[PDB]
Amino acid sequence: DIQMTQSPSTLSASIGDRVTITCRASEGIYHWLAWYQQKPGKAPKLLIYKASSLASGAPSRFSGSGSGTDFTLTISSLQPDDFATYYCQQYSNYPLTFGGGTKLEIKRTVAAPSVFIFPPSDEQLKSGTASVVCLLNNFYPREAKVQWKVDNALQSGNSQESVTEQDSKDSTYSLSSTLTLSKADYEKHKVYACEVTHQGLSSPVTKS
Amino acid sequence: MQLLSGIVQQQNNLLRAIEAQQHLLQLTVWGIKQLQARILATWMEWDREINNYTSLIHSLIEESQNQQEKNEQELLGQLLSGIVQQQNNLLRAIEAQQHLLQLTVWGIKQLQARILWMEWDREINNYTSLIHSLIEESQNQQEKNEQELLEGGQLLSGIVQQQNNLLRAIEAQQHLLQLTVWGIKQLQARIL
Amino acid sequence: QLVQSGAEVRKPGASVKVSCKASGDTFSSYAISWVRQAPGQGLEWMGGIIPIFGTANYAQAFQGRVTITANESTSTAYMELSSLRSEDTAIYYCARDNPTLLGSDYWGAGTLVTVSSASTKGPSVFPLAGTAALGCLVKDYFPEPVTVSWNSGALTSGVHTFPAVLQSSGLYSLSSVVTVPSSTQTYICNVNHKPSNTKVDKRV
């Protein structure tokens, strides 16, 4: 089948910047190439059809170009609503196939996370599990590492993490990391700590 | 009055061609439906209707080409010139679409023999591309013509309006033509 | 213009049939595609049908396990996926492929299909804990989704409802936090889980 490869996988740019993304087919597809835009929580939206035609409701700051095997989508000046994941799709031959997507992210200044820890509630410990939570609030860029620690020596390997989509006003991320352990392991140790590394932090910050 | 009379006649030539094309498109749609029903599991009459409408459209295109030649010669202001060019555009779109229809007929017949391609693909793509450009050029000429009306009575405005309806009918025909190409490609995949 | 059926839970090995209802016009001159998206992943073309012909095509990955049909008498198209595995958990979209555009001009809202052995179960809600931060841990529910508010929609700023994670139990867990001036105000999160019909509001 026809394989579609999009580049780059992710991209950061300031509101007001121009960007170009690319789509390459594994074989010639003439001009039979569509681009879609997708926001989280929503179905895709056609923006460009037949490689270069603007779909109804797509603003003129979008354009597409290319032919054969190599295609491009260009936004001349980004506005907040354009930050989204973009997919290409070929309509040359069946089966139809999408590219892997290009996520567009908003670039802004570095901001350090405010970092908070929350101990297990007494009601949850009743029942055999302790959930220790750690919040990193309103930081940029996305890259941020949590390291859990129980009685120092024990840096653990047993957690899950979740990050919001970029905030629509200040363009930051927030992150929530949950440490799961058994009632007995919780009650055996004394010191519960969360160690955040980040670009806006000279040194690791530890709350415990 | 030979130009104005030729332009009026050429409007009827084009409508008749588009009507005949419409019947042919319905026949290719029937053919594809019938083929799908057999893989899921009258053709002699189908052949005859395909042959009858194919001959008819051939003769209507020949008449429209000959009338176009006469009008272009008599033409030799911007409005009349625009109206004649828009007849040429529509005619070219119809000639191109008819060739695409004959490629779809060929596909149907091959599929049918096996239920009784790279070069095909390339030709479908070439003519599809062509037809998109001819539709685009007709849309552009149509805007131009509508602008010239603002800057011969209601006769010429009437002809411009009808040419907009002829182009609309070509666009609708292309929409359904492209749908038959997709259907034949789905059937092709299934037998390969 | 494209109305899809409601969310579904199935066990591994079972099948699901999702529907997409259109108008008359759609079924007489367009094609219908089915496209899925696993949580956090990309769009994946499953297959399509042209209702006026009944012809269909499927992606290589689903050959053998997927059937797309469309009955012109109800202008309804369906997608049936067999031998369901956990990685089939996704939002399934129908889309109208427009032959003038060679693209999809209309999409349905999407249908959650969750494939798992877990039973439907409401969440347990536990608290947490210049300015300061409090929150709610919505743990051990199934399936997605869950909705979270603070003080019945009144409190909006400083609120971050995180994407749920799927735990190793096969149940979901989500946190939702606020940042509020540390300087009398009461704080209750309101958690809606429609599949179990459970509404819980926890003071913090």
CA distance B17 to B8: 15
CB B119 within 8 Å of CB B161: no
| C133 and C148 together in one domain | yes
Q: Distances in Å between the alpha carbon of C204 and those of B21, C133, C138, C177?
A: 73, 11, 13, 11
Best probe of the A interface among C136, C137, C187, by most A CBs < 10 A, is: C137
Backbone angles phi, psi at A96, to 5 degrees: -70, 150
> Choosing among B129, B136, B179, B181, which should be mutated to test the A contact, i.e. which has the most A CBs within 10 A?
B129
Q: What residue of C is the nearest CA neighbor of A54? A: C101
A113 φψ region: left (φ > 0), alpha (ψ -120 to 50), beta (else): beta
Judge whether A204 and A197 are in contact, CB under 8 Å: yes
Phi, psi of C60 (to 5 degrees): -50, -45
Structure tokens at A113: 């996370």
Contacts of A31 in chain B (CB under 8 A): 129
Burial class (CB in 10 A: 0-12, 13-18, 19+), A12: middle
Pick the CATH number of B1-192 from 3.40.50.150, 3.30.70.270, 1.20.58.1860, 3.40.50.720: 1.20.58.1860
Choose among A94, A50, C53: nearest CA to B180: C53
Of B37, B183, B189, the CB nearest to C50: B183
Contact B182 C54 (CB under 8 A): no
Cα separation of B174 and B178, whole Å? 6
| B neighbour chains, 3+ CB pairs within 8 Å | A, C
CA distance C69 to C60: 18
Method: X-ray
Q: Is C201 exposed, middle or buried (0-12, 13-18, 19+ CB in 10 A)?
A: middle
- The verdict on C66 and C77 lying in the same domain is yes
With tokens 């940029």, the residue in question is: A140
State the CATH number of the domain containing residue C200.
2.60.40.10
Same domain as C10, residue C40: yes
Q: In what order do the strands lie in the sheet with A159-163?
A: A114-118, A129-139, A173-182, A159-163
- The C-alpha angle with vertex C63 and arms to C57 and C65, in degrees rounded to 5, equals 115
Report the 10 Å Cβ neighbour count for C180.
16
Residue found under tokens 């031959």 = A93
- Written as one letter, the residue type at C13 is G
Contact C6, C71 (CB under 8 A): no
Backbone angles phi, psi at C50, to 5 degrees: -110, 100
Based on the fold, state whether residues C111 and C179 are members of the same structural domain. no
Residue type at position B146: E
In this structure, are C13 and C113 located in the same domain?
Answer: yes
The neighbour count for residue A152, using CB atoms within 10 Å, is: 10
Enumerate chain B positions whose Cβ falls within 8 A of a Cβ in A: 121, 125, 129, 132, 185-186, 189
- The answer to whether C155 faces chain B, any CB pair under 8 Å, is no
Encoded amino acid at C16, one letter? V
Torsion angles phi and psi, residue C7, rounded to 5: -55, 150
Chain C partners within 8 Å of A130 (Cβ):
none
Q: What residues contact residue A30 under an 8 Å CB cut-off, 6+ apart?
A: A67, A68, A92, B125, B129
Are C6 and C92 in a shared domain? yes
Q: Look at residues B27, B17, B20, B18 and name the one whose alpha carbon lies nearest to residue B180.
A: B27
Residues of B in contact with A50 (CB under 8 A): 132
Chain C window 45-74: which residues touch B at a Cβ cutoff of 8 Å? Answer: 50, 52-57
What is the spatial distance between Cα A206 and Cα A163, in angstroms, rounded to a whole number? Answer: 19
Kindly state which CATH superfamily the domain A1-108 is placed in. Answer: Immunoglobulins (2.60.40.10)
Rounded to whole angstroms, how far apart are CA atoms A80 and A166?
11
Residue B175 is nearest to which of C54, C57, C99, comparing CB atoms?
A: C99
Q: How many residues are present in chain B?
A: 192
Q: C173 to chain A: which residues are within 8 Å by CB? A: 131, 160, 178
Prior bond to C12 cis, omega within 30? no
C52 and C97 inside one domain: yes
- Resolution of this model in Å is 2.0
Which domain range does residue C60 map to?
Answer: 1-117
Token pair in block for residue C160: 């971050």
Residues C130 and C100 in one domain: no
Domain with CATH 2.60.40.10 in chain A: 1-108, 109-208
Sign of CA dihedral B44, B49, B51, B52: positive
Helix (H, G, I), strand (E, B) or coil at B150: helix
Q: Kindly give the residue spans of alpha helices, DSSP state H, lying in B41-117.
A: 43-75, 78-114
- Tokens 């599929």 belong to B111
Residue B102, both tokens: 């004959």
Whether residues C109 and C18 fall in one domain: yes
Cβ <8 Å between B186 and A94: yes
Contacts of C126 in chain A (CB under 8 A): 120-121, 123-124, 131
Closest CA relative to residue A50, chosen from B91, C103, B141: C103
- Token representation of residue A24: 């390459």
Residue C162 CA, chain-centre distance (Å), reads 16
Q: What is the distance of C-alpha C89 from the center of its chain?
A: 9
User: How far apart, in whole angstroms, are the C-alpha atoms of residue B114 and residue B94?
Assistant: 31
Residues 60-119 of A with CB under 8 A from B: 93-95
Query: C160 and C181: one domain?
Result: yes
| Residue of C29, C55, C60 to mutate for B, most B C-beta atoms under 10 A | C55
Q: Does A52 touch chain C (CB under 8 A)?
A: no
Q: Where would I find the H helices in A88-182?
A: 122-125
- Domains of chain C: total: 2
Q: Extract the tokens encoding A99.
A: 């590219």
Q: Kindly state which CATH superfamily the domain A109-208 is placed in.
A: Immunoglobulins (2.60.40.10)
Bridge partners for C34 per DSSP:
C47, C94
Residue of B102, B103, B169 whose CA lies nearest to B138? B169
Instruction: Return the biggest CA–CA distance within chain A.
Output: 67
Contact B178 C100 (CB under 8 A): yes
Q: Which residues of A touch B121 (CB under 8 A)?
A: 93
> Do C100 and C122 reside in the same domain of the chain?
no
Residues C149 and C77 in one domain: no
- For A101, the closest of C42, C103, C109 (CB atoms) is C42
- Residues B175, C29: C-beta atoms closer than 8 Å: yes
